Amino acid sequence: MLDPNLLRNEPDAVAEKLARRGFKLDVDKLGALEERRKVLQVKTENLQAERNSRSKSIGQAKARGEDIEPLRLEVNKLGEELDAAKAELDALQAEIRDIALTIPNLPADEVPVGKDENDNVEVSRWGTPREFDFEVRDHVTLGEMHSGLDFAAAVKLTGSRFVVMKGQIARMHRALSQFMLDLHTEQHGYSENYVPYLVNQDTLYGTGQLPKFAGDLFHTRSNYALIPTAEVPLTNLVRGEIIDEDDLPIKMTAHTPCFRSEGLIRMHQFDKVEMVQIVRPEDSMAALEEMTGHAEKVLQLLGLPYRKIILCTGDMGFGACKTYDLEVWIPAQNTYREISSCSNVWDFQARRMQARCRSKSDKKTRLVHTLNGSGLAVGRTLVAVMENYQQADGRIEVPEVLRPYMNGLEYIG
Amino acid sequence: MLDPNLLRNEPDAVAEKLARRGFKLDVDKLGALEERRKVLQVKTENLQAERNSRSKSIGQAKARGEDIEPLRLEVNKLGEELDAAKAELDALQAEIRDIALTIPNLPADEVPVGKDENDNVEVSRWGTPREFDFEVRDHVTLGEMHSGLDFAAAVKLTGSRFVVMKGQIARMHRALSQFMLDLHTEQHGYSENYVPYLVNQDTLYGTGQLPKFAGDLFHTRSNYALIPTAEVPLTNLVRGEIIDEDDLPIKMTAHTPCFRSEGLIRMHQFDKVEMVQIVRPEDSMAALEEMTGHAEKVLQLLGLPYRKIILCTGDMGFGACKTYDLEVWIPAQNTYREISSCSNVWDFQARRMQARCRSKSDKKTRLVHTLNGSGLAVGRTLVAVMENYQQADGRIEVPEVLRPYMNGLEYIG
Known part of the structure; x- marks a missing residue:
């Protein structure tokens, strides 16, 4: 939530900044x-x-x-x-x-003003889309011809917009998540965590999912909800804590499933490797550049072409004050599709959680800043690998960095 | 469920066999x-x-x-x-x-008759418990001194009987699940699967969790329930199918979380690597020996002392007709504790699911048999490794087979 003194002292300046997001205060x-x-x-x-x-x-x-x-x-x-x-x-x-509690975060002044996704700005792009000398097959077809994708079984077990993966396709999905976790823990300084996939009301209020987005969550009749993203449990680890400034930044990562009741069709259950940073207020814009780079490194090591876009005010999510989106090249659609989103949340969540840091220079405390991003959404990364590494005979070349995680396999099929 | 002709033709012979389980028909x-x-x-x-x-x-x-x-x-x-x-x-x-639908499965004649766990029979034991020349520390203490176990954080995020794991303790939990999945898919012939962690009513009726055990499940308000074990989604993959006898046995494995609302304290959320086999009726007692051996191999490769017990009629679970339990040595308690359970379910589940096999010798169909076991419960395996490999200074030696999965680490702490 926003600073209550800001709302009382200059309600009109706040209403102006929120109008850029399309929110009437x-x-x-x-x-x-x-x-x-x-x-x-x-x-x-x-x-x-x-x-x-x-x-x-x-x-x-x-x-x-x-x-x-x-x-x-x-x-x-x-x-x-x-x-x-x-x-x-x-x-x-x-x-x-x-x-x-229903007021979105104030956007940073540097964020482009716009109404929707058409006003988002492309700021960079990496890699060149592969030129194919055969007709390009989509990921569903590729998954079915390797007997590793069964949507019909998922409907039988559960319902629509769930997926069952089998064999080498499931193994590559698994290998991707292990590669990502190893990269962020061994190279980027994130600490690994096993967290609950059910959380209580206070945890959801802390990160902003409640009250506005109750309808996007699965609730379990012990008044819990399934996590929509590992951001929720990870960020709440510092709820109610006072952290010594020398302990910051706290860098956490986790591999969890994500559940959402509600180009690339979104599932109700999908896997993500999430990155979360707790940082000093004056370091959060730098942390966002660092964290976005960590997500980019995953794409680069996998050799997937992508583009970086900065979201305009009207397309940002509730809690973000600044967001970068990474979009990966999807051959069968001849365009880029979102695969990662890294946001600086400023003190929005810290204020609800009362997560503060103590300086020791004067022992006075202030709210921390929180950041979150996906590095990456595993299932979406799988779709990109399958389509960008397909061969003419339908086989799929296993990217070099995943081979150690797939018992040396070089091709699928 | 039981054969309806058996209940009509000889209700008294059936009532006799069920009485051995303590069930009044x-x-x-x-x-x-x-x-x-x-x-x-x-x-x-x-x-x-x-x-x-x-x-x-x-x-x-x-x-x-x-x-x-x-x-x-x-x-x-x-x-x-x-x-x-x-x-x-x-x-x-x-x-x-x-x-x-509330009638338990008929026990096999060879199963020892008994009223409770005191009548279970030890049939073998492997390995010798390590002799310690220092005072033995329990797994909670060991987890806390390596800053890898935080029950207080789990209560803050969710509630009691949930766990948060961090750092090298979480990494070893992860390494165990990867080692198990690799073992069963590369060596034991199981096919890997990514399945939904939410399932519908028919799936739960199919494997026997409904109607009798509705109260043990988390239900989500799209009338779903969280899986209590990967047995539920995996076994239902053949629901309503007719399988050619030459396609059998179908051997499936998965790494999933398990959710249960309700020595070693059981959590509401814990990880398991599950093994499921769909087999010809005349092969299921052999399959149970094979599957139990697969679970034992995990214990042996990790060097953990264990004992095999055959459950008596009064201690078996609802759907089992014969069950082996593996109990691993827990140093800080100076006794063995359950870590795996492998069951032959006969045609009990197949009958509810209408999973049949076709012989082609006469094109006539009959019900398949299903088997399930854990190989192993990951969190319980972690407790055994931590306690059996502890050193005098509190460090934990990483078992040899897990080192490739933990970036070559030899010790924790």
């Missing part, structure tokens, strides 16, 4: 609730002062031997009036809280 | 429902014959020019009486079905 409704809150606050304080004043009068009447029942009744009446005012105040503060 | 309630079913059946056939007879009389009255409204009323009255009888019959057949 109802400054009038918020200001009315803030005013009614202050009135109720004064009311409870006035009633409190009256109650203490009437208590003194009861004490005097006791000492004089007078009857205190008419005074006792009024003090009890006041205590009920005070409870009613406190109930109204707590309901009003919860309504303000509800609204504040 | 209500033969009287079932026989009453069977009798009431036959009566209703005859009733609907009698009403049908009356309806056809009255239709002929209506036709004659038409030809004579008589009024057919009194005859038309009685035929409509009969059609309602016939619908009421069909509704009662379909409700009664569903009640019989409900009961039949």
Whole structure:
């Protein structure tokens, strides 16, 4: 959530920045609730002062031997009036809280202003798409002809938009996730984690999935939800913690499945290798360049052509203040398709989680910054490898870096 | 479920075999429902014959020019009486079905008769427990001193009986699952599969988890449940299929998380490498010996002492007709603890799934047999490695076979 002082001191400057995202900040409704809150606050304080004043009068009447029942009744009446005012105040503060939790993050000033994906900007591209001297086959066809892709079985077991993979296709899916985890833990300094795939309400509020995106989640009847991304459990490891500035940055990675109820068709269950960084406020723009490069290295080592785009204000996700997307070349569609997204979240999540860092130079604490990106989505990487490394006879060349993970195999099929 | 002809022809012999498991087969309630079913059946056939007879009389009255409204009323009255009888019959057949789906599998005659775990029989043991010249540390302490085990973080993210693993401890957990998958796919002839971790009602009925064990499952509000074991999705791949006898045996393996709502404390989420075999009826006792040996090979290659026990009738699981349990030596407890269970399920699941095989010698079909076992439970294997390979200074020696999977590491810490 946003800094509450920013909303109170300059609501119009905040409403301007949010309008770039296409979000209408109802400054009038918020200001009315803030005013009614202050009135109720004064009311409870006035009633409190009256109650203490009437208590003194009861004490005097006791000492004089007078009857205190008419005074006792009024003090009890006041205590009920005070409870009613406190109930109204707590309901009003919860309504303000509800609204504040639905406000997206403020975009960084450097982010291009735009309404949708057509205003995203390409900032670089790497590699040259392979020229094919035969007709290019799509990944589904390739998966079916190697008996490694069965959508019909997945419908029988579960339902639509699930996948079953078998044989060498499943082995390559597995090899990709191991290669990615090894790369980020051995070369890029990320620490490996096994996390739960079910999380509670507080974890989802912490990273921003709740309340706005409850409908995108699978909930389990022990009030849990399946994780939509490893960002949720990983980032919440520092929830409520105060971290010494010398311990930063905390770099975490994990291989998890991701669940979402809702070019490349998105599944309800898919695998991702996620990267998460907890950093000092003044280092987060640098960390985003570092993290994006880590995702690019995966693409480069696998030899997949890609392009880097910076998302415009109108296409960014709820919690991001700046986002880079990597799009990999998909031969059978003759265009690039998203495969990775790296975002700087600023202090948006840290504020909900109360994740702070302590400087020791003055022992004062401030909110950390959080960043997250995928390096990479495993299933989407598999689609890119299958299509870009296909041969004329339908076989698929195993990229060099995956061979050690696939018992030396050079070709599939 | 059991053969319905077995229940009808010799209910008393079946009730005797089920009593060995501690299951009371209500033969009287079932026989009453069977009798009431036959009566209703005859009733609907009698009403049908009356309806056809009255239709002929209506036709004659038409030809004579008589009024057919009194005859038309009685035929409509009969059609309602016939619908009421069909509704009662379909409700009664569903009640019989409900009961039949709660009946456990018949144990094999060779299985020791007993009431509980105290009547299980040890049939072999391998390896000698290491003698320690220092005080033995438990796996939790060892995990905490290598900063690779955080139960408190798991409670913060989710709740109790979940675990977070970090660093080299998570890497060894991962290495174990890769070693197991590689062993079973490269050496033992199992085919690798990526399956959904959510499944529908029919899949759970197919393998026997529903209806009796609905309360052990996490259900997601798209009426799905999280898998309690990869046995559920893997075995249902042949649901409704007719398999050529020459295609058998089908040997499948998968690495999945397992979810269960409910010595070694069981978690709600834990990893398993599962082995599943679809086989000819006359090969399933041999397949169980083969599959158990595959699980033993994992223990032997990791150098962990274990013992093999055959479960008695009273300790077997719902669907098993014969089960071997492997128990690994747990130093800090000075006893063996379950780590693997391999079961022959006979035709129990095949019957619910209608998985049949065709011989081609006479093109006649019969139910297949299914088998399942874990090779192994990854998290439990990790606990055994950590405790049996600990050194005096708290470090943990990485077993030889895992070193290639852990970038050559020889020690943890």
